[PDB]
Design a protein around this ligand. Structure first.
Ligand SMILES: O=P(O)(O)CP(=O)(O)OC[C@H]1O[C@@H](n2cnc3c(NCc4ccccc4)nc(Cl)nc32)[C@@H](F)[C@@H]1O
Ligand SMILES: O=P(O)(O)CP(=O)(O)OC[C@H]1O[C@@H](n2cnc3c(NCc4ccccc4)nc(Cl)nc32)[C@@H](F)[C@@H]1O
Ligand SMILES: [Ca+2]
Ligand SMILES: [Ca+2]
Ligand SMILES: [Zn+2]
Ligand SMILES: [Zn+2]
Ligand SMILES: [Zn+2]
Ligand SMILES: [Zn+2]
Lengths: 521, 521
């Protein structure tokens, strides 16, 4: 019997340096976690101890911190090569800077194979990207070979900017012929490594004949066997076992996000590549694991270029700016109220009509909290992690019916850590989750524009309201198809980080609170 | 039979120039009201038409606009002499600048008798103020004489700064011997002119034998017979008839406030001074009445010194700043939310503990609205009328029990246009007016200080909270005795107008709304 050790990371999101426990900028260095230097110490320790080791990434290394704003993927290719990753699957955020933002910094500079079987290149692009990413790779591991098939979220054209020359096929339809090709090459050990979320990973384990292990990403799934070591609540045991349609037990693994944990799974295979057993758990990369000095000195060299983004203080916060998913995707979060107050302030600074009183913001668009214990200081860097996408805060004209539909969509699948949960400004919404989806909004009061003194009045279906929202939502992003389809007017506004930055500078000291903007019945 | 015409003003409050309909600074001159120039045209017209005329003031000429901030009462003595007032009764605001602020500008410069029978001077002051104000005056009117007895609110030591050398006696106890003295002088026509409010005026008409007419002030009572000409709702017919204990019908009159109306009452007396009948109504001093050119040119001369208080713009409002009594004494008003946000902002600008999240503000302390149609401009003058008293915004430490008592007091006599109604910041209060007084607060949630993210939690009786409030409330003003008696700590803060001014300058453009801080069940 032959034992393989799979070490996996996913949704790291430019978290190259060690972070606070909430994955925001490290301040109190003694209690910091993750980062590539720490991950390198743990990986090295496992390589010294285990004979057959694979270090894999299931996508979304791109986007999240000033590391990616400045280096545009050169930091990813450099440090992923430094850690000696054996393979990576393409994620949706790898396309955020177009195909060009993927090809030049990453595909051309990685010393490891970058995979995706369901991505087909066509037209002019076909010749330009050919062989820069592969559907599968056969990797020698000790005296054995292990086949790795890659996959990327089929919904990527709506999540990113991959362009019109890439076709995103159904994962299962595209993976089965590639697995069948590995089987003809007599590769009997097969890992499906990809980026579509835990729900699709379970479908790949059930339906794709020949896959032994599924290593996923995109849904930031925390899986654990026993008592977890930190604040993350497990969504199931590690590994998650799926029984395939052909009757084989298939472990499905995921390792949360932000490089806080290193996934770790041991598979005992027999001579014919049948999985005998599997055990593991994600490894919390805390303070106990010391950062590698060589990687850390290299991280510090690259850090010089970034320091001029933290030299200038925009203002102060005397309160924790809760930009976490556990807060901003489930209820009113003060980071969400702050950003919506900044949007309304930027639009009301230059103004019955002409005015704009309301704001809506997808909770999943807020990508990091900001801590108040660092002397209170807010820099362009702390703000760069909250709002990393470089989008705009647009003005839209919506019928009350359209706004009520967007609010119904906001909680249609409440309890899935779905980022469509809306943060608001100039709106008082009450939800009753005991009611059937599509009828959960029990109260929707909005701030009048056509009134001398502003006050909250019930939303009228036949009335038309002006709403400030991300360009992402206006384009039907996060399943807000009703906004794109039913809007009556759409104007482009200022860059997201600049709107929030000018506001923080004006206010000097900020203290946003949870005020009852969103309530539950 | 002999007919007397009584023209009366009360609670003018430094409204020397014509004002908007809400009694704030005149902008659209075509639809402006009141002012001394307009009042002079109407009074002159009545003097040309009627043989026996008395022009009286029932108090509170002092405090309200930049006219009083700058001239400290010299404008009152000058323009009241110009209009040829025959008498004035002392009001509580005439003592706001101490006895010295009353003696030097007004008592020493008025060419008319200034009256109060229930104010007794003692100790060192007795010799200094002797004869500068009188208990009564006998005025020749045509071939007849009319006696005028004055009175001032017994509660003045708590409302103002009259000092420890003036005794404020019971109105009825002090008025009866002065009326009896006029009766021995065979004065058969007697007017009681004073400043204690409509409720006390009715008691004087009922109890003081020999008073024929009561001309009052202090409660800003609007009395009208028929259909009123403006937005003011009558509190009863004009005149209000009180049947005395000795069986005589006694008219009681009051003419609202801010010089918007001129009270006008005709009394037909018989040969023995018995009131036969009385009819009248307040005269709305609107645009139809033209301003006297001589008084207006004199008003413009004095206006030069004031212009450097309007030359500098503090910021802009895009919304009407509702500082009216009809709003701020009955429900949440946006002027109240603004001032409470300015108080919390001034105290949080330099800060679990040390912080202050809550604000309370007596609604009656907000003395004027600000209009947004004047290009949006907010000047030191517009702000001077909102906050004319020159008080401070103090920090106090209160038990939850004390705060609940202050909120119970806030609505104990709801529906009387009582200024104790509280405006708030960092507090969510719900009242149920159908409940018995002392038990009307059904919900009282406050913003936590001892929490990383601020949020609204129920008030705990056994807990201690930090509240920013006017120095007036800390001293038990407006019947908030529980604040003065039960507070655990009291620190003096910055001047009220400066706190609000620095905030408006920081914000640049303001838009406070009615947000659900105060609700009714
Ligand atoms: O890491 P992911 O692959 O995104 C999976 P997740 O559970 O961590 O985050 C999902 C949430 O994030 C929201 N979201 C993602 N990208 C964007 C985004 N920009 C991405 C982008 C799109 C097109 C071109 C370039 C960049 N803008 C906004 Cl406002 N919201 C976004 C939105 F997609 C959702 O609420
Ligand atoms: O014109 P008035 O004689 O006052 C009768 P009104 O029905 O028009 O106003 C009553 C309201 O006004 C409130 N109030 C009055 N004076 C003050 C005041 N300053 C007066 C003062 C007191 C002592 C010395 C000097 C000035 N400060 C504050 Cl915050 N609130 C006040 C307080 F008294 C009440 O809520
Ligand atoms: Ca196998
Ligand atoms: Ca008489
Ligand atoms: Zn991701
Ligand atoms: Zn993803
Ligand atoms: Zn008054
Ligand atoms: Zn008064």
């Amino acid at each position: 019997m032959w034992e393989l050790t799979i070490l996996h990371t996913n949704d790291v999101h430019s978290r190259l340096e060690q972070t606070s426990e909430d994955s925001s900028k490290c301040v109190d260095a003694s209690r910091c976690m993750g980062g590539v230097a720490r991950l390198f110490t743990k990986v090295q320790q496992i390589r010294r101890a285990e004979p057959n080791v694979l270090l894999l990434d299931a996508g979304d290394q791109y986007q999240g911190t000033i590391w990616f704003t400045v280096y545009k993927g050169a930091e990813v290719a450099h440090f992923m090569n430094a850690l000696r990753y054996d393979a990576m699957a393409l994620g949706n955020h790898e396309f955020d800077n177009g195909v060009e933002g993927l090809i030049e910094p990453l595909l051309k500079e990685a010393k490891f194979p970058i995979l995706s079987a369901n991505i087909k290149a066509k037209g002019p692009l076909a010749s330009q990207i050919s062989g820069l990413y592969l559907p599968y790779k056969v990797l020698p591991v000790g005296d054995e070979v292990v086949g790795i098939v890659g996959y990327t979220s089929k919904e990527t054209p709506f999540l990113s900017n991959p362009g019109t020359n890439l076709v995103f096929e159904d994962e299962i339809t595209a993976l089965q012929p590639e697995v069948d090709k590995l089987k003809t090459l007599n590769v009997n050990k097969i890992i499906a490594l990809g980026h579509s979320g835990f729900e699709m990973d379970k479908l790949i384990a059930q339906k794709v004949r020949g896959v032994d292990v599924v290593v996923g990403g995109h849904s930031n799934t925390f899986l654990y066997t026993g008592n977890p070591p930190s604040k993350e609540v497990p969504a199931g045991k590690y590994p998650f076992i799926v029984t395939s349609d052909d009757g084989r037990k298939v472990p499905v693994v995921q390792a949360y996000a932000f490089g806080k944990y290193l996934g770790y799974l041991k598979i005992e295979f027999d001579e014919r590549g049948n999985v005998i057993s599997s055990h593991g758990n994600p490894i919390l990369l805390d303070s106990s694991i010391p950062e590698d000095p060589s990687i850390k000195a290299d991280i510090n060299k690259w850090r010089i270029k970034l320091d001029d983004y933290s030299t200038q203080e925009l203002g102060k916060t005397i309160v924790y700016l809760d930009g976490s998913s556990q807060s901003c995707r489930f209820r009113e979060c003060n980071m969400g109220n702050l950003i919506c107050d900044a949007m309304i302030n930027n639009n009301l600074r230059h103004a019955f009509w002409n005015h704009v009183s309301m704001c809506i913001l997808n909770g999943g668009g807020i990508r990091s909290p900001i801590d108040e214990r660092n002397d209170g200081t807010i820099t362009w860097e702390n703000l760069a992690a909250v709002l990393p996408f470089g989008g705009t805060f647009d003005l839209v004209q919506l019928k009350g019916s359209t706004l009520k539909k967007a609010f119904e969509h906001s909680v249609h699948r409440y309890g899935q850590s779905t980022g469509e949960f809306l943060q608001v400004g100039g709106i008082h919404v009450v939800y009753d989750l005991s009611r059937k989806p599509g009828d959960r909004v029990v109260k929707l009061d909005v701030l009048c524009t056509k009134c001398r003194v502003p006050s909250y009045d019930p939303l009228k279906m036949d009335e038309v309201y002006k709403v400030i929202l991300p360009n992402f939502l206006a384009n039907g992003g996060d399943g807000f198809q009703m906004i794109k389809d039913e809007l009556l007017r759409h104007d482009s506004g200022d860059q997201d980080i600049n709107v929030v930055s000018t506001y923080i500078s004006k206010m000097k000291v900020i203290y946003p609170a949870v005020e009852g903007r969103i309530k539950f019945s």
